[PDB]
Amino acid sequence: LTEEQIAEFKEAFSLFDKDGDGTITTKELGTVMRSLGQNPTEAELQDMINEVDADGNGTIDFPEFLTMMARKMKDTDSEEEIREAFRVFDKDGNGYISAAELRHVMTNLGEKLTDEEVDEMIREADIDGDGQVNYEEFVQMM
Ligand SMILES: [Ba+2]
Ligand SMILES: [Ba+2]
Ligand SMILES: [Ca+2]
Ligand SMILES: [Ca+2]
Ligand SMILES: [Ca+2]
């Protein structure tokens, strides 16, 4: 949405477009991915291309890249904001939000709850039944 921003996304695109022809092919996406220790199959690479390839011509060009890369940024943004929230709630940072941790954090906001009420909250979120709220469950609740 800004000329600086459009240029930033160009540079990102340039790493994928290895031969500089304005398109990213499956192989070029394959070359890049295998530079990052991911070894995806030929059909996995076609799927990733198809997802972004809006006009179905088989490759991704800069406009299509731009569109994808913004959404990825707008999704990775919020996912970090949900992790940091989860971390403020997960007091001992072990990966699971407990009744005591929820009660304790809610209290320091102001919302002083009972053990019954905090159990109900945890139950309302505890999809996997482990008696605690993990990240997956935390994100669905929000
Ligand atoms: Ba086009
Ligand atoms: Ba295309
Ligand atoms: Ca290319
Ligand atoms: Ca915990
Ligand atoms: Ca759980």
Characterise 24 by phi-psi region: left (phi > 0), alpha (psi -120 to 50), beta (else): beta
The closest alpha carbon to 69, from 1, 19, 18, belongs to 1
Which ligand has the minimum distance to the alpha carbon of residue 89?
4
Choose one of 75, 104, 134: the last residue of a domain.
75
Same domain, 111 and 93: yes
Residues of the domain holding 141: 76-142
Which ligand has the minimum distance to the alpha carbon of residue 104?
4
Same domain, 87 and 58: no
Choose one of 24, 41, 75: the last residue of a domain.
75
Assess contact for 96 and 103: CB atoms under 8 A.
no
Which residues are CB-neighbours of 30 under 8 A, at least 6 positions away? 40, 42, 45
Question: Partners of 7 in the beta sheet?
Answer: none
Same domain, 64 and 80: no
Q: ∠ CA 123-92-117 to the nearest 5 degrees?
A: 25
Residue 65 C-alpha to ligand 2 middle, in angstroms? 9
Same domain, 1 and 71: yes
E strands, 8-105, are 23-24, 60-61, 96-97
Residue 95 C-alpha to ligand 4 middle, in angstroms? 6
Residue 26 C-alpha to ligand 4 middle, in angstroms? 43
| Resolution reading in Å | 2.2
Structure tokens belonging to residue 99? 């009744």
Experimental technique, in short, is X-ray
